[PDB]
């Protein structure tokens, strides 16, 4: 946990979240997985904490989640706003037209 939680990404995802939590009342970040061949946390794999800007309006999960950690929800639909090149680099990752 301490390993793939050292990188700057982990520290940042939080501060943003908190910054947002203070001003608007909310905030969030996500966890994701992919492969590293050089210096993997384990199993040629690592885990990483990603940031989420404008979480109040980018994350919406009304499944009728009746508590704070949305641990009892089933949706959590998120949305991304991105430039042309990004959508390009994205449709490259997830194989899309």
């Amino acid at each position: 946990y301490r390993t793939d939680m050292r990188h700057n990404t982990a520290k940042i995802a939080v501060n943003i979240a908190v910054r947002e939590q203070i001003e608007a009342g909310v905030g969030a970040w996500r966890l994701v997985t992919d492969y590293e061949d050089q210096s993997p946390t384990s199993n040629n794999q690592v885990i990483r904490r990603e940031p989420i800007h404008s979480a109040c309006s980018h994350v919406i999960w009304d499944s009728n989640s009746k508590l704070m950690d949305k641990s009892d929800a089933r949706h959590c639909t998120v949305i991304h706003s991105m430039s042309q090149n990004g959508w390009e680099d994205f449709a490259e990752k997830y194989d899309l037209d």
Binding site: H7, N8, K11, I12
Partner: peptide
């Protein structure tokens, strides 16, 4: 700032290995 001090190593460490290099420390 110090946050950027860090991205100044993620950039340095990963740089010496390309150019400066030149080490290796075996045991017995």
């Amino acid at each position: 700032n110090q946050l950027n001090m860090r991205a100044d190593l993620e950039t340095y460490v990963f740089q010496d290995n390309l150019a400066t290099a030149m080490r290796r420390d075996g045991e017995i």
